[PDB]
Amino acid sequence: MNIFEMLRIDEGLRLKIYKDCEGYYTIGIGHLLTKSPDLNAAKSELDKAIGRNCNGVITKDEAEKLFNQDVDAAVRGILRNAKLKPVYDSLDAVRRCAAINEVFQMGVTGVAGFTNVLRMLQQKRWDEAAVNLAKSRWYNQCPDRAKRVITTFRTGTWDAYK
């Protein structure tokens, strides 16, 4: 198990445009196309992301390429955010993977907004942090994509992905 396998389980892999649990246009392994309500803007963003005329469809290799880019962007996003970086750096290896997953799913801005959860994690208040995350809109609207991440923050092991 590793962060790639983890996110492949939570997000799955789809090769045409869909709405994610937040309601935004998405493809491949959780790749956010736009927050625009407009399907044309998503279709143009898919072509822009890939470098060719896709007409809403991609290959498995193109998805895996987008996926590497997106996990690298989530890690860089955490490190470059003043609120997230110290918290992240205080986490053990497995909880770091839950942190990357959360950012990959929700984005930096969304995660950074949860000031109290970040303090709970930095202070190693795993049960409280998990209770609080299970009360977010993310959990309530994305319970199948979020449940295992929250448990991972609670326990610090890979067991929810077994």
Pick the binder of Cl ion from 51, 53, 82, 93 (CB under 5 A): 93
Q: How many Å apart are CA 121 and CA 58, to the nearest integer?
A: 38
Shortest distance in whole angstroms from residue 145 CB to Cl ion:
4
Pick the binder of Cl ion from 21, 41, 75, 91 (CB under 5 A): 21
Contacts of 79 (CB under 8 A, 6+ apart): 85, 88
Shortest distance in whole angstroms from residue 92 CB to Cl ion:
3
108 near Cl ion, rule: CB under 5 A: no
Shortest distance in whole angstroms from residue 95 CB to Cl ion:
8
Contacts of 110 (CB under 8 A, 6+ apart): 138
- Contact region with Cl ion (CB under 5 A), list: 4-12, 18-26, 59-67, 116-124: 18-26
CA atoms lying within 13 Å on the CB side of residue 32 = 17
Shortest distance in whole angstroms from residue 116 CB to Cl ion:
24
- Contact region with Cl ion (CB under 5 A), list: 34-42, 58-66, 87-95, 125-133: 87-95
H-state helical runs in the chain: 3-11, 39-50, 60-79, 84-90, 93-106, 108-112, 115-122, 126-133, 137-141, 143-155
Binders of Cl ion among 129-148, rule CB under 5 A?
142, 144-145
Pick left, alpha or beta for residue 51 (phi over 0 → left; psi -120 to 50 → alpha; otherwise beta): left
Catalytic residue list: 11, 20
Q: Site residues (CB under 5 A) for Cl ion?
A: 21, 92-93, 142, 144-145
